[PDB]
Design a protein around this ligand. Sequence first.
Ligand SMILES: Nc1ncnc2c1ncn2[C@@H]1O[C@H](COP(=O)(O)OP(=O)(O)NP(=O)(O)O)[C@@H](O)[C@H]1O
Ligand SMILES: Nc1ncnc2c1ncn2[C@@H]1O[C@H](COP(=O)(O)OP(=O)(O)NP(=O)(O)O)[C@@H](O)[C@H]1O
Ligand SMILES: [Li+]
Ligand SMILES: [Li+]
Lengths: 237, 242
Amino acid sequence: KKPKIITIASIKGGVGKSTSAIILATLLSKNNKVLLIDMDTQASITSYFYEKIEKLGINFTKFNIYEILKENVDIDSTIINVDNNLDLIPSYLTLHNFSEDKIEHKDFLLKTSLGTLYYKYDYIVIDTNPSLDVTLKNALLCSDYVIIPMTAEKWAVESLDLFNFFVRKLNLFLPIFLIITRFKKNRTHKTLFEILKTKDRFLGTISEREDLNNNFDLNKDYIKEYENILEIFLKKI
Amino acid sequence: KPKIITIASIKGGVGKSTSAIILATLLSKNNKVLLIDMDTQASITSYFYEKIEKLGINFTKFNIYEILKENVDIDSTIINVDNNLDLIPSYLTLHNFSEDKIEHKDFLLKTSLGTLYYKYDYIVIDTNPSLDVTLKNALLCSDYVIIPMTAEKWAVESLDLFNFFVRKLNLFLPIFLIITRFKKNRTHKTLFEILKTKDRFLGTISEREDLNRRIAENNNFDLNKDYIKEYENILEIFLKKI
Ligand SMILES: Nc1ncnc2c1ncn2[C@@H]1O[C@H](COP(=O)(O)OP(=O)(O)NP(=O)(O)O)[C@@H](O)[C@H]1O
Ligand SMILES: Nc1ncnc2c1ncn2[C@@H]1O[C@H](COP(=O)(O)OP(=O)(O)NP(=O)(O)O)[C@@H](O)[C@H]1O
Ligand SMILES: [Li+]
Ligand SMILES: [Li+]
């Protein structure tokens, strides 16, 4: 009946933000039509699907998220059927210029463009830069929910507070959910789990697994962890 | 004067911080060196965090962001982390810098370094993988740029995009190139053949398991194994070219 738009965000890189975006989107696509938007200048998601993009002959140096934001192409012509029930808007390195571009109403470009999107998805999942920048603002201003992958490091609580402060400044009342990634059984992960596990939007934990880098998934032990996380998330919204 | 080197790249995970640490450490053998951690990831800061904690530094008040906000003086943020090596630490509040509205925002680090009493032979600045106002602050007071590159797709295009960004700054900074995480395969040969002809190419760093382990979490001292020799060759070629 309406698209549910989930931003995956984290101010620290290497916390499984992009990995969680791919796997949650893929799990959702089992019974839903899902759109991935790769708004990360690293373009991790895009290059995970690059072999598929190549076999289809997509010209993503012309049709990508940055050119949507610059209003040079329409969003309809950028969408790539990369997997079962899964579409992608690819990222491209020119996106690096977005932060310095001078544009009117720059914060609302993604929201405006999504208002001109003919195709209809059950879920839209947005990967973001590990930064509190105008790109994150574009994702947040059209989102319904946020999922933040966290690791049990020093400044983990402080980093979550800084993100909360950034969303407040946007005058937004977004449910913000928490995942603990790279989970190991030791004191450092117990302290963060003990803090996080009390919060109503804590979804669960992902264990550090070597087997989980552009190969298909086989529903192993780490996929089950994401499956439990997704089930809890769906019960809370 | 101090010679001021920015380490930059627009792809993350290319050994940017690792190269900043190891080059600053090598230089510190015969020089007084200042490391400035201007990366919101704070990789350099948390590589030295055990030393910082033993000294009891309150770097949530004295850090690179509070310098840029003109809330603390640069002299009081400096931490002696190793032999002949000083550090200005990064702290997570630096994330707000990109959204702060400030006059002459591009020149805050340059102005700040003009008020620095201490005198260094070399200053080495670690940066975010981003074409943002933070990167501009580093470039506008640097003498040289070192870019670590990997054999990824679009690496040439990414270098062309970086050079265009430096050019728009009305800057004529010598830009040097390192190929990092080098493995023996076709993809790395293609980039090597492209880069090795360029005039400020410095050489290559091989991907090594023991170098991952020493900085990954062990926060370990270096032992001058084969990858340290690779960095030593890169530094010597660099020093002969400036
Ligand atoms: N639970 C995990 N188990 C094993 N490896 C992991 C796990 N989470 C992340 N990684 C690895 O961590 C690295 C970083 O990927 P990832 O963290 O997903 O990027 P990111 O944090 O989202 N930053 P970005 O790529 O800009 O979106 C990759 O090598 C992943 O394979
Ligand atoms: N040559 C190498 N051999 C082995 N591991 C490496 C090598 N270069 C980098 N790494 C590892 O790659 C990871 C990230 O390296 P890093 O120096 O942070 O790149 P960077 O992302 O460009 N700099 P930064 O963003 O500030 O952390 C670390 O775990 C390093 O140990
Ligand atoms: Li398909
Ligand atoms: Li489809």
